[PDB]
Amino acid sequence: VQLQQSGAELSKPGASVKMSCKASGYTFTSYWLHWIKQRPGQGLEWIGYINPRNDYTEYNQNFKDKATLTADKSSSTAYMELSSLTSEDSAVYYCARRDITTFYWGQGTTLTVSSASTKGPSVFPLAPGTAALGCLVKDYFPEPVTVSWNSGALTSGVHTFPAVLQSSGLYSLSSVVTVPSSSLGTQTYICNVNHKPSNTKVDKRVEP
Amino acid sequence: IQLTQSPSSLAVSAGDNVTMSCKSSQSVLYSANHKNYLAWYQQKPGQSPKLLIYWASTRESGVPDRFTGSGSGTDFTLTISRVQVEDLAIYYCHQYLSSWTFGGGTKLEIKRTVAAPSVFIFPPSDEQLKSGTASVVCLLNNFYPREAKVQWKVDNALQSGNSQESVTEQDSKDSTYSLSSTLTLSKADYEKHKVYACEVTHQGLSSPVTKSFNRGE
Numbered sequence: 001v002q003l004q005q006s007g008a009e010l011s012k013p014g015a016s017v018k019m020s021c022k023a024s025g026y027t028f029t030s031y032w033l034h035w036i037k038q039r040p041g042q043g044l045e046w047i048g049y050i051n052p053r054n055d056y057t058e059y060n061q062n063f064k065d066k067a068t069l070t071a072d073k074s075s076s077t078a079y080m081e082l083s084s085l086t087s088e089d090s091a092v093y094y095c096a097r098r099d100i101t102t103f104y105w106g107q108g109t110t111l112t113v114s115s116a117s118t119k120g121p122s123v124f125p126l127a128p129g130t131a132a133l134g135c136l137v138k139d140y141f142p143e144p145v146t147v148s149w150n151s152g153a154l155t156s157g158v159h160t161f162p163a164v165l166q167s168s169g170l171y172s173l174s175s176v177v178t179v180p181s182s183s184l185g186t187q188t189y190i191c192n193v194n195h196k197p198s199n200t201k202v203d204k205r206v207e208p
Numbered sequence: 209i210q211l212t213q214s215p216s217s218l219a220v221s222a223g224d225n226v227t228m229s230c231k232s233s234q235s236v237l238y239s240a241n242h243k244n245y246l247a248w249y250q251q252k253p254g255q256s257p258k259l260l261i262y263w264a265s266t267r268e269s270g271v272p273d274r275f276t277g278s279g280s281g282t283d284f285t286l287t288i289s290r291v292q293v294e295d296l297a298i299y300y301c302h303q304y305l306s307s308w309t310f311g312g313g314t315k316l317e318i319k320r321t322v323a324a325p326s327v328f329i330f331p332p333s334d335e336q337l338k339s340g341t342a343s344v345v346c347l348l349n350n351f352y353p354r355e356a357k358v359q360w361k362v363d364n365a366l367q368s369g370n371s372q373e374s375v376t377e378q379d380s381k382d383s384t385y386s387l388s389s390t391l392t393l394s395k396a397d398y399e400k401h402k403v404y405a406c407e408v409t410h411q412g413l414s415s416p417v418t419k420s421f422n423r424g425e
């Protein structure tokens with residue numbers, strides 16, 4: 001059994017978006033298909049379900065005007081459309097269903113609603129017995145970025161902080177690591193930054 | 209059917225016992241098979257929710273025995289015996305009698321002894337300065353508990369409103385936090401002043417710790 005959800009979604013306010021949930025490994029019409037919203041300060045919230053056998057839908061009252069659930073028997077795929085989007089709709093969304101000895105959840109689809117447009121980060125060095133160094137990963141949209149150090153050869157003492165949303169509507173974060181001061185002249189330190197939405201890749205040497 | 213979880217958050221040391229409550233506004237006990245349609249999920253930071261228990265008390269495959277679910281009808285309990293550092297997560301209950309409901313979750317934090325932060329200050333880079341904006345960064349490393357304050361000073365003038373902070377999740381091994389504070393100045397303002405300082409307080413510090421630099425030195 002597998003529930004495969006569609007990729008990350010980006011939307012301007014007031015528009016609508018439609019995400020999918022492809023079911024495999026069982027008879028699609030035999031189980032109701034539920035949708036769940038995960039928003040940072042709102043826990044988990046049930047949106048509603050569709051009975052794929054008959055297309056009957058039932059909604060959480062809080063989503064009766066926001067979500068529209070549909071299903072395609074021939075392709076074993078359920079859909080959720082979210083309309084009149086605002087930043088309050090930014091969240092991770094899941095499809096799920098129950099079984100006799102478990103529950104099956106999709107991997108989730110992330111939705112960001114913003115007036116911002118996709119933009120790669122600028123990467124700036126944070127220059128250094130213990131020394132701290134890092135990289136400032138500034139002014140990107142949407143989330144996420146990934147940061148590694150020395151192509152993964154350096155992991156201990158690394159802290160890559162959660163992004164903050166700036167007043168510009170762009171994100172910024174820093175990644176830091178602590179190393180022996182005595183190592184600065186014998187070991188190179190490089191932050192590897194990747195922002196896949198913009199295909200941005202930056203590998204910056206950080207030196208005192 | 210409404211679900212109420214308590215407490216909303218708690219901090220418990222490794223090795224100790226944890227009990228958390230989930231109460232439903234209606235019975236989720238199905239008379240035909242005498243099963244409670246209630247489950248427990250564990251959601252670790254950055255991960256999707258993972259099923260721990262179903263039928264109120266049946267462990268999902270792979271779940272260790274230190275997780276125990278109990279209760280019937282409307283009153284349910286999740287117990288974690290001898291909590292381990294890996295058990296840091298938000299725990300949600302879930303009723304599925306027909307439609308679904310989720311509780312508000314109980315955030316389990318790992319309690320440990322107090323640790324004061326180590327502090328580091330970073331000037332803005334020459335490259336960024338070519339762009340009209342200056343970001344000054346201060347790092348607070350490996351501290352507990354989570355609460356701390358960074359006070360920025362520019363030529364001994366207290367700054368307000370032009371900083372943003374971000375805190376890591378608890379370290380998987382030592383349960384400490386780290387924090388970054390970023391001070392945002394125009395390049396014009398940055399080049400008009402000399403002494404840049406971040407003054408740090410934390411409940412483990414007897415007196416504030418200040419790190420500073422002089423622009424261009």
Ligand SMILES: *[C@@H]1O[C@H](CO[C@@H]2O[C@@H](C)[C@@H](O)[C@@H](O)[C@@H]2O)[C@@H](O[C@@H]2O[C@H](CO)[C@@H](O)[C@H](O)[C@H]2NC(C)=O)[C@H](O)[C@H]1NC(C)=O
Nearest residue numbers: 223224225226227274275276277278286287288289290291
């Ligand atoms: C933490 O709890 C353990 C386990 O006891 C519980 O007992 C049941 C009533 C139920 O609540 C289960 O979820 C638990 O298993 C305590 O360990 C027991 O300690 C007593 C006295 O030393 C001993 O006779 C038992 O055999 C122990 N049981 C196990 C499983 O080891 C433990 O003392 C508790 N610790 C604290 C600090 O409260």
